[PDB]
């Protein structure tokens, strides 16, 4: 059972910056991760699989990278439909583990 | 033109068990597992298991083993689990499906089925 | 005729005690085999594909992906130990004797009875079972071997292991050929390797059918079909294994230091230093003489590539090995790679009160020490120095290619001139008895399956079916379905193999290990207040021999 541990349970963003989403794992994984977007009320969305590759239909201002036990997640010009809940789920080995999920909201 | 749907919101007693169900459609059932995710507002999102349709191959894991059992009904392309106990439980239940690639990455969920056990 | 008996029921072993020191063991062996109809009368071209499992990256080896031919012929199979000797006569093979070889084979069938069923029903859903006088078996012996070469007990679809139980014969099938591609993968690929089935090379088409290639029989009910006694020609297989691996061959060294007080701890010493020792080595520019670098006159047994799966024209494969090693560095939960694992049913072996879907299973391991164990191998620089160093040695704990779970013992090969190993042990009462040898132009020396290979010829497969019987509405210009009357045959077979084993002797002083019945194991051989029957699998080379 890996645990997977998000740098952040909250980030504060404005709109049209660049916001640097990281999910720590315990185990190495390789690049085995996928990174899901959840507005609250709502079904998981899925961006990213294999911690670079982006979803067919997802717009090009998310980006990830990583490998080993450090990932992150990048938004590149966050917009106003870009503030919700962002979970990270390893597809390494089961049992599928996802993170604690992190908040983009707005810098008072 | 994949698509999943849940079941109701339930309300159980704190006693037994109530099956939760998501109707698959818009693509060949026993091509895909379906996965099922919970989700408590405190615990972020939990995997419970799998179930392949091509003649029941199930995993979980251990912290629903006796919790709850996955089936699935062939020709109807229905997904089904019992959630045996259901004691402090109350959490939305996901119905997850892969997706193209091949990595176990839930691309289709189901709109969630909100189970509120109580006294 | 109609109520006249066409043969006898014969099921009992019989040891021919013959010229001084080989004993002609005959067993005798006859079924009640229990066959209906066919759901088709066509020769489909299935072809099974999942992609659901093998699709999903990271599991390569739960790939099935094959094309066959399901046919309307049934199948009677006998090529497995148990169908020919009960447990209370391995026992007199396996500890008595000490090489056996395979005589011959017949086969009969007797006794033909053939119903058919018709529900009356005016409200109950009752059924009526009929003599038909008139409906015949069709019984087909491919004595040239024409048809693929299928057996059936790596399926472990035999006829059943108990004399009183009535059997069934197995809906006989081959493949047809496919071609498909599966690039391997794990879990954190990006993007998706191929996994494409092409479809069939237009070279390599065979359909056979059992029509166009065997004379088949029409037996009635009374009719009788026996066929002829094929007599084998094979290698004999030793009841005895070897207990020397490459360090017990030869003279050991002279130990000027014994010890003076008899006891666990008070070790026997070489007197001399090893740098200072006389013996053969191989190793050309090092003065040590250990028990571990002196030259031996070969090597027993050899290193594969363990969890290796090789790809081909139709899919993934894994190679096979040849590989025992019994107790000492073998835990309980991962034995060995290489010793096989049998699943059966209550059929064949598993306990005949158990309602449940899954089979019973047990791991072979043999009592023969020539495997290998690769956490204690270690590949060394040609320099040799004294404690080596980290740059001069390869382990089996650094990682190969990157892989902290795949070392370089993973994909080591000793395969050479110089290694000798020993052919497969029977495995009662799974294992096959014989197979047939490749029609190819090298031919393999083992076969990891089966302890006999039959080389020029093997017998012939032995298929049977019942002949249709057609209701008055039948017309073979509808696309639809042909129309039956519900038939089903209950025919007697009877199987006669003979081997012929020579009796071990007794070359030294202290007893050797004996397959017995104990407290922990007497309620194995015995039935359990319902009849509840199983056989428990037995090893097959108790006795040891000196490889050297």
């Known amino acids: 059972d890996i645990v997977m541990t998000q740098s952040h349970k909250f980030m504060s963003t404005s709109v049209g910056d660049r916001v640097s989403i990281t999910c720590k794992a315990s185990q190495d994984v390789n690049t085995a991760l996928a990174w899901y977007q959840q507005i609250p009320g709502q079904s998981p969305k899925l961006l990213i699989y294999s911690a670079s590759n982006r979803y067919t239909g997802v717009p090009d201002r998310f980006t990830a990278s990583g490998s080993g036990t450090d990932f992150t997640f990048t938004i590149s010009s966050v917009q106003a439909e870009d503030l919700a809940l962002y979970y990270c789920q390893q597809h390494y080995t089961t049992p599928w583990t996802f993170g604690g999920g992190t908040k983009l909201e707005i810098k008072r | 033109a994949v698509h999943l749907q849940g079941t109701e919101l339930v309300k159980p007693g704190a006693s037994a068990g109530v099956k939760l169900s998501c109707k698959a459609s818009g693509y060949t059932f026993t091509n895909y597992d379906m996965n099922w995710v919970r989700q408590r507002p405190e615990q972020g999102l939990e995997w419970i298991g799998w179930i392949f349709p091509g003649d029941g191959s199930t995993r979980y894991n251990e912290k629903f083993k006796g919790k709850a059992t996955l089936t699935t009904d062939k020709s109807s392309s229905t997904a089904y689990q019992l959630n045996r106990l259901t004691s402090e439980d109350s959490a939305v239940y996901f119905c997850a499906r892969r997706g193209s690639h091949g990595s176990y990455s839930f691309a289709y969920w189901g709109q969630g089925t909100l189970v509120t056990v109580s006294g | ?548």
């Open chain 3, 1 to 548: 005729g109609v109520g006249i008996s066409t043969g006898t029921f014969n099921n009992q072993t019989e040891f021919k005690f013959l010229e001084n020191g080989w004993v002609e063991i005959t067993a005798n062996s006859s079924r009640l085999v229990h066959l209906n109809m066919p759901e088709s009368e066509n020769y489909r071209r299935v072809v099974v594909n999942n992609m659901d499992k093998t699709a999903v990256n990271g599991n390569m080896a739960l790939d099935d992906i094959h094309a066959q031919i399901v046919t309307p012929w049934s199948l009677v199979d006998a090529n497995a130990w148990g169908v020919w000797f009960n447990p209370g006569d391995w026992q007199l093979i396996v500890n008595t004797m000490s090489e056996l070889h395979l005589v011959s084979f017949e086969q009969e069938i007797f006794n033909v009875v053939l119903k058919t069923v018709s529900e009356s029903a005016t409200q109950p859903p009752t059924k009526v079972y009929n003599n038909d006088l008139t409906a015949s078996l069709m019984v087909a012996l491919d004595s040239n071997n024409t048809m693929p070469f299928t057996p059936a007990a790596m399926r472990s679809e035999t006829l059943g292991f108990y004399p009183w139980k009535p059997t069934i014969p197995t809906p006989w099938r081959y493949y047809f050929q496919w071609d498909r591609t599966l690039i391997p993968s794990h879990t954190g690929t990006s993007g998706t390797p191929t996994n494409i089935y092409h479809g069939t090379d237009p070279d390599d088409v065979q359909f056979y059918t059992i029509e166009n290639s065997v004379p088949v029989h029409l037996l009635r009910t009374g009719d009788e079909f026996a066929t002829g006694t094929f007599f084998f020609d094979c290698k004999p297989c030793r009841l005895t294994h070897t207990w020397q691996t490459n360090r017990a061959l030869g003279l050991p060294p002279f130990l000027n230091s014994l010890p003076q007080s008899e006891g666990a701890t008070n070790f026997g010493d070489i007197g001399v230093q090893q740098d200072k020792r006389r013996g053969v080595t191989q190793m050309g520019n090092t003065n040590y003489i250990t028990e571990a670098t002196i030259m031996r006159p070969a090597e027993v047994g050899y290193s594969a590539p363990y969890y290796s799966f090789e790809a081909s024209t139709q899919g993934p494969f894994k190679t096979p090995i040849a590989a025992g090693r019994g107790g000492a560095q073998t835990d309980e939960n991962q034995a060995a790679d290489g010793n096989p694992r049998y699943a059966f049913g209550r059929q064949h072996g598993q306990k005949t009160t158990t309602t449940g879907e899954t089979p019973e299973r047990f791991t072979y391991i043999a009592h023969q020490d020539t495997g290998r164990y690769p956490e204690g191998d270690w590949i060394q620089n040609i320099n040799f120095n004294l404690p080596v160093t980290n740059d001069n040695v390869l382990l089996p704990t650094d990682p190969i290619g990157g892989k902290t779970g795949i070392n370089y013992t993973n994909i080591f090969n000793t395969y050479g001139p110089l290694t000798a190993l020993n052919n497969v042990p029977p495995v009662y009462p799974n294992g096959q008895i014989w197979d047939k040898e490749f029609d190819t132009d090298l031919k393999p020396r083992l076969h990891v399956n089966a302890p006999f290979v039959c080389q020029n010829n093997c017998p012939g497969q032995l298929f049977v079916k019942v002949a249709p019987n057609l209701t008055n509405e039948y017309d073979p210009d509808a696309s639809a379905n042909m129309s039956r009357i519900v038939t089903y045959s209950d025919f007697w077979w009877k199987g006669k193999l003979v081997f012929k084993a020579k009796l071990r002797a007794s070359h030294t002083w202290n007893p050797i290990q004996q397959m017995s019945i104990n407290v922990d194991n007497q309620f194995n051989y015995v039935p359990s207040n319902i009849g509840g029957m199983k056989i428990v699998y037995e090893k097959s080379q108790l006795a040891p021999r000196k490889l050297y």
